[PDB]
Every structure is written in C-alpha cells, then in structure tokens.
C-alpha cells in the first residue's frame, strides 16, 4: 500500500500516445496545480505597518538623540532586513525546479516511497482552512528538496522554508527566494555591544505572525544542523517560541504541526568520517553525483493541534523539576519564564521523538547492525541472509516501517554494494558461496556505525534493560532492575531521546521490563524475576548488551581522562585533547569498539559531566572554561564515578 513519486509514465498524465510517452514528464509538470493567487502577498508592507514593529522602531531611535528625524535611518534599515528576509514564490520557478529535481532524483536514486494513507490525512489537514507546520528531521541536504517536491507532486502549495543566512549570496539567494526559502540570522545578535536587536526580533516575529495569519505552510528543521552521528540530536526551541508566541498573543486561532521522517538507504553526502576523525572540490562533486544511491522513504506522522496540545500541558498538576545530577549522584555517592522555557523546550523533543519514531528502517541499517555487533568476525552470505529475515520480523513485530521488500538475498546483496567501502567480499575454501567481513579500522568503522545507528532507536530501551540485567547480577529483584535501568537512562540522556518527555523513565523501564515477561525472556519465580537460560534468549541478551558497547566505552574512557585533569582550560581546546585520547586508544589497540572514537560521543560525555556538574561551567570572553567542582575536587568521588560506569559495560 505504497506510492513511488518518481515513477511517472504516461499513465500518470491524461494525454496518451507515442509522442505523449516520449514527453511523459513535461506533461506531468504541466498538469500540476500551483498558481500565484494561493501565496501570501503585501508581506513587507503588512510587516512594516505592524503596530509592534513601529513601536519597536520608536524606542530604538529614541536612544540616538541630543526633533527626532533620524527615524528615516532606522526605518530605512528595518526595510532592508525584510528585503533580504522575505521569500517571493513563482509557480514558473517551482515547476521548472520540480522538473529538474524529477530528472535528478530519478538519476541518483532508486525510488522515493510514500504511504498513501499518511498523505490522504495531510490532504484532509490541507482542505481545513488552517496554517500547517512541517517539522522534518535533518539528515542530508536532499531533505529540504524532498519535503517540498513530495507536496508539489500531490497538488499542494510549496511551504515557506526557514533557511540559514549562509545561503544568502548573490544569484543563489534570488533563486531560493523564488522557491519559498526565507533567510534568518544565526543567534539573532547584531553585536555584543547591544543586548538584543529589538528591531530584528520584532521584524522576525512580525514576518512569521503575518506569514501564518495568511494560512500558508511553514518548514522549520528543529535540529539546527544535520546529524553527524546518524541519529536525532538535541532539539532547538528557537523558532517554536516565535510560532507559539503567535498563538499565545491570540492573533491566529490554531496551527497544525506535522512531524516528518525522511529515511535514506544511502545519504548522497555519504560517511561523516572527515568531521568525526577531527578544481579538486568540483572534481569531487563530479565524483559524488556520478555514483548511484539506494531507496528513500518519507513518513508523515499524524497532524495534531498545537492549541489542544498547549491546553493538555495545563492539565498536568505538577511538572518535572528533577536534575540529571540530583537523579544520579545521590544514588552513586553516599520560575515564571523557566516553566515557559520547559513548556516550549519539551514540545521540540516530543516532536523530534514522534518524527524519529516514524522514520522507516532500511536494508543498510539492518545489514550494518548485524555486521558490527551480531558477527564482527564476519560470516558467509547464507547465515546473514537467514538473520536478515529474523531481524526484519523483530522490527515489524515492534510496529516499525521497512524501506525495502522482496528477496532477502537480493535486498542484502543490494545493501552490501552500498557498504562496499566498509565491507570486504572474499571467497572461502571448497565453497561456491562468498564470505563477508566488515572493516575494524579507524576511519572505515565510523561509516558502518553511522548507518548502524539507523536501527539503534528501535532497540535502545531493551538494550538499557539488557545492560542493567547484566549490571544487577554482578533471581533478580524487579525493583532494583527498574531503579538501576532508570539511571542508565539519566546517564545516556544526552546521547538521544529514549521515550516521550510527558512520562518519567521509571514508567518507561517498568513498561520495558513488562515487555520482557510478554516476550518471555524474564519470568516470575516486590517481585523476583529469573532470566530464561535459553541459547536464543542469551544470544539476544548479549546482542542487546553488545549494541550499547560504543556508547558506554566512550563515556568510560572519558572518565579515565578526568582521573588526571590539570587546571581550568577552554572547552574547544579540551574536546580536541579528549578526542585525541579516544583515537590514541584505537591507535594502540586498547579500545575494543573503534566506533567509540567518533567526535559526537565526546561532546555528549562532556555535556553529560557538565549536567552531572563534575565540570562546573564558568564561561568567560564568550567561551566555556571547565572548573573541577568542589564535590569532585578529591579523587575518591571520580574513582566511584569511574567504578559506576564500568558496572554496565561487559569486560
């Protein structure tokens, strides 16, 4: 029950015949319904006529005086900001781009899958007179080309995209402006001379207020950048404040929010090893686009009402105040605007979770997951083909989408040829069957790990309970397992979203222990559970244990570096000589999983220690210098902090 948006023969057009086939596409572009009338107009004028904006202008001028006829200057400046900000969509441009993208996608992709039922909802959300808001998860640059192209090819008007100021350059800007992309500043700060450019912020508020008030569609990537790790990073609540404020003020009745999940079998950009490790370009871009990449699946979550969601928050009698340190450390070592911050901050996480949990699991995702953790030593095809069937069922049985179908053999054989850089395909003695080992080198592994992290979010919970199960043992008391698991969540907090922000970890772990008894891995003898001593269950427990190896090893070997920490140092200088150590631990062959040396997990560990408050952040001259906290001034605390993390990791 799917749809391939790129698959366009004459059957997708009205006119038919030899000629009508030969020019199939050009007709399909002609038949699309996009006119100038259904786009917001008089935007600059309406934003410059705003009573908030003119008052914001009125006071910024007032400061500059010894009558006050300098208003001309600030007003003339205020205009120029909107002149570089606002977008101006041209149906002519959109069609002609859509045509090109329909050629190019059909060149360097195999297909782009859409579940009709998910879009038939969006076409019901469209035909109610409300402004929609599309919140995808940033992974590759192609994300912002797809989201629009998918809608354009179902007779839906292109959304106005919130774009980084980087792209604002001559020619390339005036193209983007005509394709809906409106440019916004980074940090919204002219200079540290001024506190806040009240004018710019008021104009930015006004623009979005106006663009929503005219019932147009908005596209915001809540992840400031695309993910280097290959999993959803920390959500930014920058613009969601601007969009919620619009509702808070009562200038528009309601907004619909649509989480989107775009999964790639192979991202055009490829591995991020170049960053994670720490003429000739244009040649590289030719070398880039001449390669083929795999399948794509874009998954739209159910549109929900922000108005109702914001009411639903006011039904909660008490909010979550517990600190990451106050959760963990006491178990290891014997308001007015702050509520408003948390309120909008949680929404962003709730969205990214919903989006990330829509993303379809790919073939590469499943192959990498097996190759890294299930085997590593490397296996002959037949065993991997039989496993690829077994894993596929494990994913479907947990209610997740697959971005592949057909013969397991062929779906794996396709997926190998994408991982051809990491994977080595050889011939074994007295066999017609071919052998498959992955790379365990410094640079190659990161590519396998990156694509492997695609599946991590399906098993992330069961893995925490699987690690905690091993932890508690060194006839389990259920309370202790939940209590122990609950911290391993607070510890791996920064690494990624584990569950919905609206419920506590205790409950999530209780439910996931509740799942293990339903599967029948744990059974009843306060409650006393026993682990099923069955080959299949044990190998699954050890797979789930192994799966979190890199994510614990890095956090362990991070604390091994803290053991000897000399004086206060700037963080950007520290992170490099912490990241050096983890590379040096592969270089010497001390670190087990070479995955751990990735730059992403280093930032997570330091932010985790900064959340725990081992390093007291005392930022100066616009950089974070790390002060070794009074609690962790002695050695015996850091010793226990090291001993603790070691309990979860298998030796």
Ligand X SMILES: CC(C)(COP(=O)(O)OP(=O)(O)OC[C@H]1O[C@@H](n2cnc3c(N)ncnc32)[C@H](O)[C@@H]1OP(=O)(O)O)[C@@H](O)C(=O)NCCC(=O)NCCS
Ligand Y SMILES: CCCCCCCCCCCCCCCC(=O)OC[C@@H](O)COP(=O)(O)O
Which residues are annotated as part of the binding site for CoA? 186-187, 196, 201, 236, 341
Write out the two tokens for 453.
Answer: 């992290």
Element (H, E) at 339: helix 336-356
Tokens for 310, please give them. Answer: 């914001």
Show contacts with ligand Y in window 45-74 (CB under 6 A). Answer: none
Residue 459: closest CA among 385, 538, 378, 540: 540
**Residue in 409, 359, 404 with CA at minimum distance from that of residue 387:** 409
Q: Write out the binding residues.
A: 186-187, 196, 201, 236, 341
Strands 379-380 and 626-628: unpaired
Query: Does residue 8 bind ligand Y (CB under 6 A)?
Result: no
**How crowded is the C-beta side of 331, counted as CA atoms within 13 Å?**
18
Instruction: Determine how many CB atoms are found less than 10 A away from the CB of residue 642.
Output: 15
**Among 236, 375, 376, 580, which residue interacts with ligand X (rule: CB under 6 A)?**
236
Contact with ligand X (CB under 6 A) among 149, 221, 388, 644: 221
Three-point CA angle 89, 95, 101, nearest 5°: 110
Q: Check residue 185 and report its DSSP letter.
A: -
Are 544 and 463 within 8 A, CB to CB? Answer: yes
Q: Which does 145 bind (CB under 5 to 8 A by kind): ligand X, ligand Y, none?
A: ligand Y
For ligand Y, the closer of residues 137 and 522 by Cβ is: 137
Q: Tell me 39's DSSP state.
A: S
Q: 81 near 203, Cβ under 8 Å?
A: yes
| 583 vs 589: CA distance, rounded Å | 10
Around Cβ 584, how many Cβ atoms within 10 Å? Answer: 12
Q: Is 138 in the site for ligand Y (CB under 6 A)?
A: yes
Which tokens go with 166? 């980087």
The site partner of 75 among ligand Y, ligand X, none (C-beta below 5 to 8 Å per kind) is: none
| From the list ligand X, ligand Y, none, partner contacted by residue 238 (C-beta under 5 to 8 A by kind) | ligand X
- Asked whether position 144 contacts ligand Y by CB under 6 A, the answer is yes
Residues 6+ apart with CB under 8 A from 279: none
Binding-site string for ligand X from residue 345 to residue 374, where x marks contact by CB under 6 A and - marks none: x-----------------------------
Residues 239-268 that bind ligand X (CB under 6 A): 239, 241
Tokens of 293: 């990449």
DSSP 375: I
The answer to whether 613 contacts ligand X (rule: CB under 6 A) is no
What is the closest distance, in whole angstroms, from the C-beta atom of residue 360 to ligand Y in the complex?
22
Decide if residue 2 touches ligand Y (CB under 6 A): no
Residue closer to ligand X by CB (options 248, 480) is: 248
425 φ, ψ to 5°? -105, 110
Contact range with ligand X by CB under 6 A, out of 157-165, 352-360, 424-432, 440-448: 157-165
* Site membership for ligand Y, residue 230 (CB under 6 A): no
Q: Quick check: 152 binds ligand Y (CB under 6 A)?
A: yes
Compute how many residues bind ligand Y; rule: CB under 6 A. 22
Euclidean distance between the first and final Cα of the chain, in Å?
A: 46
- Does position 145 interact with ligand Y (CB under 6 A)? The reply is yes
Instruction: State the residue for tokens 């005509």.
Output: 178
In the list 28, 43, 57, 98, the residue contacting ligand Y (rule: CB under 6 A) is 98
Q: How far is the CB of 181 from ligand Y (least distance, A)?
A: 3
Residue whose token pair is 């997708």: 12
Per rule CB under 6 A, is residue 145 in the interface with ligand X?
no
Stretch that binds ligand Y, among 35-43, 141-149, 350-358, 449-457 (CB under 6 A): 141-149
Mask for 566-595, x = binds ligand X (CB under 6 A): ------------------------------
Nearer to ligand Y, 98 or 294 (CB): 98
- The CA–CA distances, whole Å, from 207 to 74, 165, 240, 588, 592 equal 18, 16, 14, 56, 53
For ligand Y, the closer of residues 200 and 221 by Cβ is 221
| Among 197, 362, 355, 372, CA closest to 267 | 362
- Determine, following the binding rule CB under 6 A, whether residue 43 of this chain makes contact with ligand X: no
HEC string for 269-333? CCCCHHHHCCCHHHHHHHHHHCCCCCCEEEEECCCEEHHHHHHHHCCCCCCCCCCHHHHHHHHCC
Phi-psi bin for 405: left (phi > 0), alpha (psi -120 to 50), beta? Answer: beta
Place of tokens 């682990």: 531
Q: Kindly report the backbone phi and psi dihedral angles of residue 184, in degrees, each rounded to the nearest multiple of 5, phi listed first.
A: -130, 145
Mask for 286-325, x = binds ligand X (CB under 6 A)? ----------------------------------------
Beta carbon of residue 138, minimum distance to ligand Y (angstroms, whole number): 6
User: Hey, which residues between 154 and 173 contact ligand Y (CB under 6 A)?
Assistant: 158, 161, 163-164, 167
Q: Which stretch binds ligand Y (CB under 6 A): 7-15, 123-131, 140-148, 412-420?
A: 140-148
Is residue 85 near ligand X by the rule CB under 6 A?
A: no
When asked if residue 141 is in the footprint of ligand X (CB under 6 A), the reply is no
Binding status of residue 358 toward ligand Y by CB under 6 A: no
39 touching ligand Y, by CB under 6 A: no
Closest CA to 301 of 135, 521, 540: 135
Number of residues that bind ligand X (CB under 6 A): 18
Contact partner at residue 186 from ligand X, ligand Y, none, CB < 5 to 8 Å by partner kind: ligand X
**Residue 352 or 513 with smaller CB distance to ligand Y:** 352
Contact map string, positions 166 to 195, toward ligand X, x by CB under 6 A: ------------------x-xxx-------
**164 contributes a contact to ligand X by CB under 6 A:** yes
Q: Is there a contact between 234 and 148 (Cβ–Cβ < 8 Å)?
A: no
Q: Does 408 bind ligand X (CB under 6 A)?
A: no
> Is 220 a binder of ligand Y (CB under 6 A)?
no
Which residue, chain included where needed, has tokens 């009843």? 524
Q: Could you give the strand order of the β-sheet that contains 528-531, starting from the edge strand earlier in sequence?
A: 476-477, 528-531, 522-524
Binding stretches for ligand X (CB under 6 A): 162-164, 184, 186-188, 220-221, 224, 236-239, 241, 341, 344-345
Binding stretches for ligand Y (CB under 6 A): 94, 97-98, 101, 138, 144-145, 148-149, 152, 158, 161, 163-164, 167, 176, 179-181, 221, 225-226
């Amino acid at each position: 029950g799917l749809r391939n948006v790129i698959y366009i023969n004459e059957t997708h057009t009205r006119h038919r015949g030899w000629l009508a086939r030969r020019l199939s596409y050009v007709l399909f572009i002609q038949e699309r319904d996009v006119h100038k009338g259904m786009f917001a107009t008089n935007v600059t004028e309406n934003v410059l006529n705003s009573s908030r904006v003119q008052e914001a202008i009125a006071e910024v001028a007032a400061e500059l005086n010894p009558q006050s006829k300098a208003v001309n200057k600030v007003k003339k400046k205020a205009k120029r900001i909107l002149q570089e900000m606002v977008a101006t969509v041209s149906p002519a441009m959109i069609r002609l781009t859509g045509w090109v993208l329909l050629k190019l996608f059909n060149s360097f992709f195999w297909n782009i899958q859409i579940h009709k039922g998910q879009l038939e909802m969006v076409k019901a959300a469209t035909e109610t007179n409300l402004p929609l808001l599309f919140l995808p998860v940033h992974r590759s640059h192609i994300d912002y080309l797809l989201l629009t192209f998918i809608l354009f090819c179902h007779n839906i008007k292109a959304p106005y995209i919130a774009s980084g100021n980087n792209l604002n350059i001559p020619i390339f800007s005036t193209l983007i402006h005509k394709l809906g992309g409106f440019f916004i500043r980074r940090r919204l700060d002219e200079t540290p001379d001024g506190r806040k450019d009240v004018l710019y912020r008021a104009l930015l508020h006004g623009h979005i207020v106006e663009l929503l008030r005219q019932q147009q569609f908005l596209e915001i990537f809540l992840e400031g950048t695309r993910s280097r790790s290959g999993k959803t990073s920390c959500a930014r609540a920058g613009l969601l404040s601007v969009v919620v404020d619009t509702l808070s003020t009562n200038v528009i009745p309601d907004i619909l929010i649509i989480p989107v999940g775009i999964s790639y079998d192979r991202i055009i950009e490829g591995h991020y090893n170049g960053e994670q490790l720490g003429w000739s370009v244009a040649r590289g871009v030719i070398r880039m686009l001449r390669k083929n990449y795999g399948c794509v699946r874009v998954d739209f979550a159910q549109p929900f009402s922000l108005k109702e969601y914001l009411e639903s928050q006011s039904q909660k009698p008490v909010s979550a105040l517990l600190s990451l340190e106050q959760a963990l450390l006491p178990a290891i070592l014997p308001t007015d605007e702050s509520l408003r911050r948390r309120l909008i901050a949680n929404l962003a996480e709730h969205i990214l979770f919903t989006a990330s949990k829509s993303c379809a699991i790919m073939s590469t995702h499943i192959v990498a997951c097996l190759l890294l953790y299930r085997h590593r030593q490397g296996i002959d095809l037949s065993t991997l083909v039989e496993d690829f069937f077994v894993m596929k069922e494990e994913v479907l049985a947990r209610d997740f989408d697959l971005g592949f179908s057909g013969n397991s053999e062929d779906v794996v054989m396709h997926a190998i040829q994408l991982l051809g850089n990491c994977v080595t395909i050889t011939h074994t003695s007295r066999n017609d069957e071919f052998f498959i080992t992955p790379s365990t080198t410094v640079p190659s592994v990161f590519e396998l790990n990156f694509y492997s992290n695609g599946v991590l979010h399906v098993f992330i919970m069961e893995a925490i309970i699987a690690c905690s199960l091993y932890a508690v043992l060194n006839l389990i008391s259920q309370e202790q397992l939940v209590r122990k698991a609950a911290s391993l969540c607070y510890l791996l907090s920064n690494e990624g979203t584990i569950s919905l922000p609206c419920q506590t970890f205790y409950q999530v772990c209780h439910e996931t222990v509740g799942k293990f008894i339903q599967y029948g891995i744990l059974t009843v003898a306060d409650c006393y559970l026993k682990v099923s001593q069955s080959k299949e269950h044990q190998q699954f427990i050890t797979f789930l244990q192994r799966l979190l190896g890199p994510l614990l090893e890095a956090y362990s070997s991070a604390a091994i570096f803290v053991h000897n920490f000399s004086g206060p140092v700037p963080e950007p200088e520290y992170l490099q000589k912490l990241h050096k150590y983890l590379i040096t631990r592969t270089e010497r062959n001390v670190a087990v999983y070479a995955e751990s040396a990735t730059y992403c997990l280093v930032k997570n560990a330091v932010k985790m220690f900064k959340d725990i408050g081992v390093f007291k952040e005392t930022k100066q001259k616009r950089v974070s210098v790390l002060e070794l906290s009074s609690t962790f001034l002695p050695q015996c605390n850091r010793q226990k902090l090291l001993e603790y993390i070691l309990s979860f990791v298998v030796l």
